[PDB]
Design a protein around this nucleic acid. Structure first.
Ligand SMILES: [Mg+2]
Ligand SMILES: [Mg+2]
Ligand SMILES: [Mg+2]
Ligand SMILES: [Mg+2]
Ligand SMILES: [Mg+2]
Ligand SMILES: [Mg+2]
Ligand SMILES: [Mg+2]
Ligand SMILES: [Mg+2]
Ligand SMILES: [Mg+2]
Ligand SMILES: [Mg+2]
Ligand SMILES: [Mg+2]
Ligand SMILES: [Mg+2]
Ligand SMILES: [Mg+2]
Ligand SMILES: [Mg+2]
Ligand SMILES: [Mg+2]
Ligand SMILES: [Mg+2]
Ligand SMILES: [Mg+2]
Ligand SMILES: [Mg+2]
Ligand SMILES: [Mg+2]
Ligand SMILES: [Mg+2]
Ligand SMILES: [Mg+2]
Ligand SMILES: [Mg+2]
Ligand SMILES: [Mg+2]
Ligand SMILES: [Mg+2]
Ligand SMILES: [Mg+2]
Ligand SMILES: [Mg+2]
Ligand SMILES: [Mg+2]
Ligand SMILES: [Mg+2]
Ligand SMILES: [Mg+2]
Ligand SMILES: [Mg+2]
Ligand SMILES: [Mg+2]
Ligand SMILES: [Mg+2]
Ligand SMILES: [Mg+2]
Ligand SMILES: [Mg+2]
Ligand SMILES: [Mg+2]
Ligand SMILES: [Mg+2]
Ligand SMILES: [Mg+2]
Ligand SMILES: [Mg+2]
Ligand SMILES: [Mg+2]
Ligand SMILES: [Mg+2]
Ligand SMILES: [Mg+2]
Ligand SMILES: [Mg+2]
Ligand SMILES: [Mg+2]
Ligand SMILES: [Mg+2]
Ligand SMILES: [Mg+2]
Ligand SMILES: [Mg+2]
Ligand SMILES: [Mg+2]
Ligand SMILES: [Mg+2]
Ligand SMILES: [Mg+2]
Ligand SMILES: [Mg+2]
Ligand SMILES: [Mg+2]
Ligand SMILES: [Mg+2]
Ligand SMILES: [Mg+2]
Ligand SMILES: [Mg+2]
Ligand SMILES: [Mg+2]
Ligand SMILES: [Mg+2]
Ligand SMILES: [Mg+2]
Ligand SMILES: [Mg+2]
Ligand SMILES: [Mg+2]
Ligand SMILES: [Mg+2]
Ligand SMILES: [Mg+2]
Ligand SMILES: [Mg+2]
Ligand SMILES: [Mg+2]
Ligand SMILES: [Mg+2]
Ligand SMILES: [Mg+2]
Ligand SMILES: [Mg+2]
Ligand SMILES: [Mg+2]
Ligand SMILES: [Mg+2]
Ligand SMILES: [Mg+2]
Ligand SMILES: [Mg+2]
Ligand SMILES: [Mg+2]
Ligand SMILES: [Mg+2]
Ligand SMILES: [Mg+2]
Ligand SMILES: [Mg+2]
Ligand SMILES: [Mg+2]
Ligand SMILES: [Mg+2]
Ligand SMILES: [Mg+2]
Ligand SMILES: [Mg+2]
Ligand SMILES: [Mg+2]
Ligand SMILES: [Mg+2]
Ligand SMILES: [Mg+2]
Ligand SMILES: [Mg+2]
Ligand SMILES: [Mg+2]
Ligand SMILES: [Mg+2]
Ligand SMILES: [Mg+2]
Ligand SMILES: [Mg+2]
Ligand SMILES: [Mg+2]
Ligand SMILES: [Mg+2]
Ligand SMILES: [Mg+2]
Ligand SMILES: [Mg+2]
Ligand SMILES: [Mg+2]
Ligand SMILES: [Mg+2]
Ligand SMILES: [Mg+2]
Ligand SMILES: [Mg+2]
Ligand SMILES: [Mg+2]
Ligand SMILES: [Mg+2]
Ligand SMILES: [Mg+2]
Ligand SMILES: [Mg+2]
Ligand SMILES: [Mg+2]
Ligand SMILES: [Mg+2]
Ligand SMILES: [Mg+2]
Ligand SMILES: [Mg+2]
Ligand SMILES: [Mg+2]
Ligand SMILES: [Mg+2]
Ligand SMILES: [Mg+2]
Ligand SMILES: [Mg+2]
Ligand SMILES: [Zn+2]
Lengths: 91, 112, 252
RNA sequence: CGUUGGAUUGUUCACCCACUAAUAGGGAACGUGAGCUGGGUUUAGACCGUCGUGAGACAGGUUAGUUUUACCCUACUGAUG
RNA sequence: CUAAUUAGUGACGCGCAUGAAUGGAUUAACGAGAUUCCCACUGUCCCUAUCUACUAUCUAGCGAAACCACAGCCAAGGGAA
RNA sequence: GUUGGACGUGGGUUAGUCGAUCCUAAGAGAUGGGGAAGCUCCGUUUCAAAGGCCUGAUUUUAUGCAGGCCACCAUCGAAAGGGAAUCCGGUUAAGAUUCCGGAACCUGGAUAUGGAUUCUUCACGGUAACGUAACUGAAUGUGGAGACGUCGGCGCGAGCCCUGGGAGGAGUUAUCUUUUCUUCUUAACAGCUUAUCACCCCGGAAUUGGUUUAUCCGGAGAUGGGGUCUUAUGGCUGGAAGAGGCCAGCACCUUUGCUGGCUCCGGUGCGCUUGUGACGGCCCGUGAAAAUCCACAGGAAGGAAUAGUUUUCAUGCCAGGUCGUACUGAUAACCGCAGCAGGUCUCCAAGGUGAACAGCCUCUAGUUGAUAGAAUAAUGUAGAUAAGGGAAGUCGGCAAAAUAGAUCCGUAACUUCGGGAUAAGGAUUGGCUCUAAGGGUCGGGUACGAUCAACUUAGAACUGGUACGGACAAGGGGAAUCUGACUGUCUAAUUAAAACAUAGCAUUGCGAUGGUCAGAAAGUGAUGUUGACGCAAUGUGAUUUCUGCCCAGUGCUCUGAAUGU
């Protein structure tokens, strides 16, 4: 049965700190506690500890990620833009 | 109902002061101090507790015979088998492709 | 009156950095034969959390070219580098996230972190979580490179100055609210003793220019000149403007 | 010979309700703090208004703020001799 | 609201001298914070009474201190009023 | 005061294993140097010609030179961190892991016998995980141990708690109780054996399976069958019954014996404390260092058949210094002028009631210390009660009273949807006697039976001077205004608050030849193991909402001006 209407994980803060703050936090918390798909071994075993650090349960590979999420928008576009400029060098 | 005292000057619950209670032939309860538990040695490649090896506190490894400190395969008391399995296959295939790499660029120089 | 709070920090008593748990200084490899002629290969053996830092370090080991032994380095980890990955460092080196190359050897638009100010200093600019610098141009005669730092500033440095491809990891850290005093508390617990902050306006005159009065208030303009002397500088130092910033920021 | 009971106010004062035969005015170090109480005033904390560049000020508003000793002499109450 | 209210609350506003991070307005939750009323409760009161223990009190032993010009019954008079 | 922590006179503290000692922590601090008139200040690997190990070369000989390394560059700093190794019984007026008795272990130095190994020189076995009584290994290199947060439930161990049978001793016995109390123990160390996890072999999976209290795992090979490993921990045996515990039966001024017997077999668990494992939660917090020990990679070299190699296998020999070791540790051995109702770090922890380390009563142990006697006036201090009224008392309900556990019913405005809420408001609660539901374990060809061990929950009768959370224990509630968002902080000793802080919001400075700050100076220092998602400097003060106009003045600032000072 549905336990809470909005607060979700964020209900540990009870009534404190004001809703907008709890809003923002609930976002990044859901983000940071999630299991992510592993680039290398294919299972979703990637979890976090220590912001910026993302490792795989089996396969034991650790990746340097964003603070609350594995890949961040910036690093993503940066990735492709390095790809672009690189291919300009060989061909 | 029978209570007990530390056997040393040290009054406090620090990890070197761990205690155990024991019934003696005198028929009474008495503390006996307890050394910290030893931990299993670990593979350098991966980090699992490497099997076959006895687990003692570091200086006790000097008081034991060499069979307790090794297993019979190469990299015995060091790496974890399946890890050694890998560095065999890796070594071999790389040393092979190293031949494949030379003769291909040996021709590339000759036809170009 | 008393010596105010911002004067007492320089004597470094209770204000020195809380250093005990730190992994050790993050630096690029020494700039040597291999790195300025060829390239040299390494493995990231680990990527690890440094205390009081936003962004993870990466332990990267190399072979010692002049002696049989391993030599381990501490890098700030760029987003996307991973354990087991091979790192290449040198003048001639492929352009890939995680590698370290001289700023001259990368095209404009290239994005790099931990970039050196002078060549050899083992990195200065853009080390904080999320940050990078962009190469905005080259001057091959006198071999300089023009970059834009995180502040928005545009600086020109030697093209020999090394940098590492990609951006620094752990970005977005500052988007999450601290939400409570304790989170801040543990935050500065691993940095230095800067927290919490008493307002000068809550103090007595002995303590601070702002101190005193039967109502809390500054009493004179809080914009202080550069020419000001120690014990005088508190509030807004050398401010060229003040007030809510309206309209777009972002230098032309 | 008696001259009161209450609502608001720290109040004296004022002002209403109500009873009553009547709800007279005064003194006693503006009786009476080793008799009390401590609400006001009037130290040190603090908010606001006004004034002052400021420290700070206000006979303006507001809140929190340690009430010591008698076994002596006399007086007084009783008590022996 | 009360029998009665210099109290409280809701209104009104040419507001001595409200007012916008000198932050303005609103605000669930929280408070050994200031204030008002209500229910319960009651010796707070009308109006006092009674009980327990330890004191005080009398005895043995033990045994200080403060303070002290000289001292210690009043009315009036004058007199540093 | 015959007593004492007083007075007088003596006696008493035993270590290879317990501490110091060794290591490193924040930190402290010599040295080549650089400052300073100088007492001295700075720096600690820093602009320095910074030192010592392994063996070979000697057969004038004792240690010169021949190699090759290592460039690690003082030292001090933990009686709670790291750390080689000891236990049980007995014993003193007072010492004991220190003495005695027995039984071990470590380190260093010596070493010889046995075993192992070799004519295939430097061991075999197993498909494998890996096995072992052994099974050469210099430089160099690499790995591991030392070595690490916190909370949660779950599993297991130990000690304690509860308890059946029996063998002893004790208590009660008008009556009743096959009863109440008590003894029944097993060290370090050693042998064999014992494990969650992990891993190997066979096998090839949808009809997806396995599986935790907690949803995690499998074609990167699950479920299944068979094996391998760690030895926390437990079991049996050695130690070791000869010790210790409990009894009976004799001896006698003594030192004090002597002789016997018994010391056995079980059960139970959301119990309690503590240890530990496999997991899970948390973080802009991810939770020391060094000494030291071992291993592996490497293969320098040294080595046998007429006899070599081996001291990481067994047994054997010698040695282990210096200092502390008594006692108190607190309502009398410390600090408070004192034998002061104050202060002062910590380990062990029985039974009942009960949610309980609460209160209240008890066992073991320890106390019974605090001037005493006689009375019980006033006034007190501390503890209680009061008819009818019910805040009329007071600045003010100050003080006091009321409430309270648990099960069940029932619960408003408003709200950031999380709360508000134990809202408010109600019923019930003893004793005794029954009923019902809830589990374990074993054999079933390739439906059930049999046995043993637990207080929980609900329902039903009976019963009482209508009592029953019977003592103890235990929230008063409601409607508003002002004010601070909240948790948190301060005026030790008159102010705890609306003051301070906080998250959030905003502004300012700075790209290192720098910002802010320290210093007499410096080859000086903090931020800095740092780099704008940063450091430094101010203001406002959670959320929601909104932050208007004024740059003349005072400040601050400027790619500006120029013929005034
Ligand atoms: Mg002792
Ligand atoms: Mg602990
Ligand atoms: Mg073994
Ligand atoms: Mg082995
Ligand atoms: Mg070999
Ligand atoms: Mg430092
Ligand atoms: Mg601080
Ligand atoms: Mg501030
Ligand atoms: Mg502040
Ligand atoms: Mg102040
Ligand atoms: Mg000043
Ligand atoms: Mg000023
Ligand atoms: Mg001021
Ligand atoms: Mg102000
Ligand atoms: Mg009156
Ligand atoms: Mg009145
Ligand atoms: Mg009044
Ligand atoms: Mg009037
Ligand atoms: Mg009147
Ligand atoms: Mg007069
Ligand atoms: Mg008077
Ligand atoms: Mg008087
Ligand atoms: Mg007085
Ligand atoms: Mg007062
Ligand atoms: Mg005052
Ligand atoms: Mg007042
Ligand atoms: Mg107060
Ligand atoms: Mg007197
Ligand atoms: Mg008196
Ligand atoms: Mg009124
Ligand atoms: Mg009233
Ligand atoms: Mg009003
Ligand atoms: Mg007005
Ligand atoms: Mg007027
Ligand atoms: Mg404004
Ligand atoms: Mg104002
Ligand atoms: Mg709101
Ligand atoms: Mg309150
Ligand atoms: Mg008296
Ligand atoms: Mg008498
Ligand atoms: Mg007397
Ligand atoms: Mg006295
Ligand atoms: Mg007279
Ligand atoms: Mg006369
Ligand atoms: Mg005497
Ligand atoms: Mg003596
Ligand atoms: Mg003596
Ligand atoms: Mg020791
Ligand atoms: Mg020594
Ligand atoms: Mg020095
Ligand atoms: Mg030392
Ligand atoms: Mg020590
Ligand atoms: Mg220690
Ligand atoms: Mg003994
Ligand atoms: Mg003796
Ligand atoms: Mg003793
Ligand atoms: Mg002995
Ligand atoms: Mg012996
Ligand atoms: Mg030896
Ligand atoms: Mg053999
Ligand atoms: Mg090592
Ligand atoms: Mg390690
Ligand atoms: Mg530690
Ligand atoms: Mg032992
Ligand atoms: Mg199996
Ligand atoms: Mg098999
Ligand atoms: Mg086995
Ligand atoms: Mg259970
Ligand atoms: Mg961890
Ligand atoms: Mg080892
Ligand atoms: Mg030996
Ligand atoms: Mg010596
Ligand atoms: Mg002792
Ligand atoms: Mg004593
Ligand atoms: Mg005392
Ligand atoms: Mg018992
Ligand atoms: Mg006394
Ligand atoms: Mg008494
Ligand atoms: Mg008496
Ligand atoms: Mg009385
Ligand atoms: Mg009664
Ligand atoms: Mg009454
Ligand atoms: Mg009533
Ligand atoms: Mg009333
Ligand atoms: Mg009155
Ligand atoms: Mg009244
Ligand atoms: Mg009042
Ligand atoms: Mg009241
Ligand atoms: Mg009260
Ligand atoms: Mg009553
Ligand atoms: Mg309410
Ligand atoms: Mg009943
Ligand atoms: Mg049943
Ligand atoms: Mg008010
Ligand atoms: Mg508050
Ligand atoms: Mg509070
Ligand atoms: Mg105070
Ligand atoms: Mg308070
Ligand atoms: Mg106080
Ligand atoms: Mg706000
Ligand atoms: Mg100089
Ligand atoms: Mg504030
Ligand atoms: Mg702030
Ligand atoms: Mg407008
Ligand atoms: Mg206009
Ligand atoms: Mg202006
Ligand atoms: Zn993976």
């Amino acid at each position: 049965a549905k336990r809470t209407k909005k607060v979700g994980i964020t209900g540990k803060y009870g009534v404190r700190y004001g809703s907008s703050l709890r809003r923002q936090v609930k976002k990044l918390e859901i983000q940071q506690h999630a299991r992510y798909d592993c680039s290398f071994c294919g299972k979703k075993t990637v979890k976090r500890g220590a912001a910026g650090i993302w490792t795989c349960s089996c396969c034991k590979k650790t990746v340097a990620g964003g603070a609350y999420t594995v890949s961040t928008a910036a690093a993503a576009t940066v990735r492709s833009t390095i790809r672009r400029l690189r291919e300009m060098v060989e061909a | 109902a029978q209570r007990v005292t530390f056997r040393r000057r040290n009054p406090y619950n620090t990890r070197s002061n761990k205690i155990k209670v024991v019934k003696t032939p005198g028929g009474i309860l008495r503390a006996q101090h307890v050394k910290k538990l030893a931990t299993r040695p670990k593979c350098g490649d991966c980090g699992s507790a490497l099997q076959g090896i006895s687990t003692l506190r570091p200086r006790q490894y000097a008081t034991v015979s060499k069979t307790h400190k090794t297993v019979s395969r190469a990299y015995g008391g060091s790496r974890c088998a399946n890890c050694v399995k890998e560095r065999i296959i890796r070594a071999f295939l790389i040393e092979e492709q190293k031949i494949v790499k030379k003769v291909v660029k040996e021709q590339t120089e000759a036809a170009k | 009156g008393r010596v105010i709070r911002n004067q007492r920090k320089g004597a470094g008593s209770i204000f020195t950095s809380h250093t005990r748990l730190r992994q050790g200084a993050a630096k690029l490899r020494t700039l040597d034969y291999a790195e300025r002629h060829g390239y040299i290969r390494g493995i990231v053996k680990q990527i690890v959390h440094d205390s009081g830092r936003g962004a993870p370090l990466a332990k990267v080991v190399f072979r010692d070219p002049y002696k049989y032994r391993l030599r381990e380095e501490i890098f700030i980890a760029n987003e996307g580098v991973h354990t087991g990955q091979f790192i290449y460092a040198g003048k001639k080196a492929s352009l890939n996230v995680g590698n370290v190359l001289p700023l001259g050897s990368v095209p404009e638009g290239t994005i790099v972190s931990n970039v050196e100010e002078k060549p050899g200093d083992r990195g200065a600019l853009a080390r904080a979580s999320g940050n990078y610098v962009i190469i905005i141009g080259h001057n091959p005669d006198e071999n300089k490179t023009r970059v834009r730092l995180p502040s928005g500033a545009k600086k020109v440095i030697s093209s020999d100055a090394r940098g590492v491809i990609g951006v620094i990891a752990g970005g977005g850290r500052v988007d999450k609210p601290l939400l409570k005093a304790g989170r801040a508390f543990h935050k500065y617990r691993l940095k230095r003793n800067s927290w919490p902050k008493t307002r000068g306006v809550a103090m007595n005159p002995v303590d601070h220019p702002h101190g005193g009065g039967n109502h809390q208030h500054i009493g004179k303009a809080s914009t202080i000149s550069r020419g000001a002397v120690s014990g005088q500088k508190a509030g807004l130092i050398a401010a060229r403007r003040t007030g809510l910033l309206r309209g777009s920021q972002k230098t032309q």
